[PDB]
Design an enzyme around this catalytic site. Sequence first.
Site, PDB file in Angstrom:
ATOM      1  N   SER A  26       0.826  -1.211   0.000  1.00 24.71           N
ATOM      2  CA  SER A  26       0.000   0.000   0.000  1.00 24.71           C
ATOM      3  C   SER A  26       0.854   1.253   0.000  1.00 24.71           C
ATOM      4  O   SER A  26       1.816   1.348   0.770  1.00 24.71           O
ATOM      5  CB  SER A  26      -0.923   0.002   1.213  1.00 24.71           C
ATOM      6  OG  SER A  26      -1.708  -1.180   1.240  1.00 24.71           O
ATOM      7  N   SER A 104       2.399  -6.670   1.760  1.00 23.88           N
ATOM      8  CA  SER A 104       1.310  -5.813   2.244  1.00 23.88           C
ATOM      9  C   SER A 104       0.024  -6.062   1.442  1.00 23.88           C
ATOM     10  O   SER A 104      -0.417  -7.215   1.321  1.00 23.88           O
ATOM     11  CB  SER A 104       1.833  -4.359   2.159  1.00 23.88           C
ATOM     12  OG  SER A 104       0.854  -3.355   2.329  1.00 23.88           O
ATOM     13  N   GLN A 105      -0.604  -5.014   0.911  1.00 25.02           N
ATOM     14  CA  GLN A 105      -1.822  -5.202   0.122  1.00 25.02           C
ATOM     15  C   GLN A 105      -1.499  -6.118  -1.058  1.00 25.02           C
ATOM     16  O   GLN A 105      -2.351  -6.899  -1.503  1.00 25.02           O
ATOM     17  CB  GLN A 105      -2.353  -3.856  -0.394  1.00 25.02           C
ATOM     18  CG  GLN A 105      -3.674  -3.993  -1.142  1.00 25.02           C
ATOM     19  CD  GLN A 105      -4.236  -2.678  -1.667  1.00 25.02           C
ATOM     20  OE1 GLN A 105      -5.021  -2.681  -2.617  1.00 25.02           O
ATOM     21  NE2 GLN A 105      -3.862  -1.561  -1.049  1.00 25.02           N
ATOM     22  N   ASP A 159       4.451  -7.413  13.575  1.00 21.30           N
ATOM     23  CA  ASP A 159       3.824  -6.889  12.371  1.00 21.30           C
ATOM     24  C   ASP A 159       2.344  -7.174  12.568  1.00 21.30           C
ATOM     25  O   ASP A 159       1.875  -8.310  12.405  1.00 21.30           O
ATOM     26  CB  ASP A 159       4.335  -7.565  11.097  1.00 21.30           C
ATOM     27  CG  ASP A 159       3.771  -6.920   9.846  1.00 21.30           C
ATOM     28  OD1 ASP A 159       2.808  -6.122   9.949  1.00 21.30           O
ATOM     29  OD2 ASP A 159       4.289  -7.202   8.753  1.00 21.30           O
ATOM     30  N   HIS A 172       6.619  -4.146  10.237  1.00 23.01           N
ATOM     31  CA  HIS A 172       6.045  -4.298   8.901  1.00 23.01           C
ATOM     32  C   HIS A 172       6.940  -3.687   7.825  1.00 23.01           C
ATOM     33  O   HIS A 172       6.778  -3.988   6.637  1.00 23.01           O
ATOM     34  CB  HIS A 172       4.681  -3.604   8.849  1.00 23.01           C
ATOM     35  CG  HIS A 172       3.956  -3.775   7.548  1.00 23.01           C
ATOM     36  ND1 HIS A 172       3.433  -4.983   7.139  1.00 23.01           N
ATOM     37  CD2 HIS A 172       3.613  -2.876   6.592  1.00 23.01           C
ATOM     38  CE1 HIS A 172       2.794  -4.824   5.993  1.00 23.01           C
ATOM     39  NE2 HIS A 172       2.888  -3.555   5.643  1.00 23.01           N
TER      40      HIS A 172
END
Length: 197
Positions: A26, A104-105, A159, A172
């Site tokens: 993201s 992530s995303q 995370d 993260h």
Amino acid sequence: RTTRDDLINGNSASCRDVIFIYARGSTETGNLGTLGPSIASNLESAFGKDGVWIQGVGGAYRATLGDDALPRGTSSAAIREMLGLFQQANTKCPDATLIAGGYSQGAALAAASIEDLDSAIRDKIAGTVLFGYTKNLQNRGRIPNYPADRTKVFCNTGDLVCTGSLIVAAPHLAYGPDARGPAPEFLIEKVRAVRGS
């Protein structure tokens, strides 16, 4: 560096034996973000520039903040984009071994895409690496419909996205070492194995 479209640009009469499709996190820039270039350079060291095509998931995938909160952890438009890249790889280079990854995303995107993929194409994906996997808790550390032995999940202690949250904490943002070492070694070993005998 941060944008690679080797599959889309690649001359079809000179297909690479290995095609890597990667989805960024993201808000990240280009179509590779922060981790993709590290993985790519290591894959290039192994197979050479003509031996592996690096393809980031761009197009409709904007890695928008907030799309993380959608049901599958990303947008339908993003899923369509990545499924489209897998389809393009399958048709443009039928003999190629595929490898994938996401952060992530992008990790949620890779998982959803692989889950929905036609089984014949999914079987061609020798290995997939996921960093800061936002659907880690929900999917119990797996990519639905895809074997555990071909999956490598990197989820750091602390995370929060790995434990069901969407909040970005310090751990993260610490997958750089994993992207430079263990992740590409995993992918390369999986490719060497499936294409070997």
